Amino acid sequence: SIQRQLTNERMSQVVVHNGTVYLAGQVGDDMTAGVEQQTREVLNSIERLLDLAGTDKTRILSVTIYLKDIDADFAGMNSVWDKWLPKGFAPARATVEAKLCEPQILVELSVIAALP
């Protein structure tokens, strides 16, 4: 049916429904760091959540990327993103400017993936 993982009153980090994995929005850990390091931390977090969900980063379907300042940080975010996935397995992607819930958060990813 529906499986939920890492749940509190506000959200589940992982929701799995009929083979599709929906992740809560993910942000980085170090609030003093630039967009490159925050993006690395986001991608590490996503990998951990995909492990728990029962899939892996070659089965990502669609990612929406929110940047606090797209003019400042698009290129730095891309420099990390473009190295993340094996060639041939990149998902659909969309990248837009939207402030996150704290001013030090420079990047947030919303991920949809697939179970094997």
Place this chain on the structure above:
Amino acid sequence: SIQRQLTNERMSQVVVHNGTVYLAGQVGDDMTAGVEQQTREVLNSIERLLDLAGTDKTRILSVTIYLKDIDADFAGMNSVWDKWLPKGFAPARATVEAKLCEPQILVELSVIAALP
């Protein structure tokens, strides 16, 4: 196949495909009210649409929340959101700042849910 409900030339409020429910973006009713009351009105609207789609608020998979001013209204929106769903059934969630189509609209939700 695909079922559509509450359809005009621009959008359907409800689209159901192979067990997944996609709702049009939902906003509140009272444009003079604060983010808490607008969020309550949004959640009521979502519940009505889920009723029509054939599911309920314990089967929500992923919600993206847009706030006109995330610094001003994140906490007020959360105060309503956090009370909405039974413990254990919260969906994936992402919350970002994006202006809605009228300046008095403080919050808009995009919902993906599942049929039983």
Place this chain on the structure above:
Amino acid sequence: SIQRQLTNERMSQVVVHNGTVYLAGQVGDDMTAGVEQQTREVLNSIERLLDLAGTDKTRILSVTIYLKDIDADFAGMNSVWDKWLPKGFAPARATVEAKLCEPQILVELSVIAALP
């Protein structure tokens, strides 16, 4: 399983999983043009991608529309959008203000569709 089309290191334009089509974010071609012409170009691009994915514009499930300036361009975007699809087949829709990766880009669409 998962089919990917028009793939580079950063993204696939088309990802198909278990009957659901996820498109990469689409923008227009003419950066000097207004939101109406850019929206037309976006919709043409979407139609080409849906052709490749094996579906068509009457099987769109959900679209999120990002506008650089929602106050300026909501109405112009709508004037094109509202004419696009046969009556009765409109998807779920959400429209918000989010800057795209270049200042001349006025509109970007993220599309989820269904295979027949």
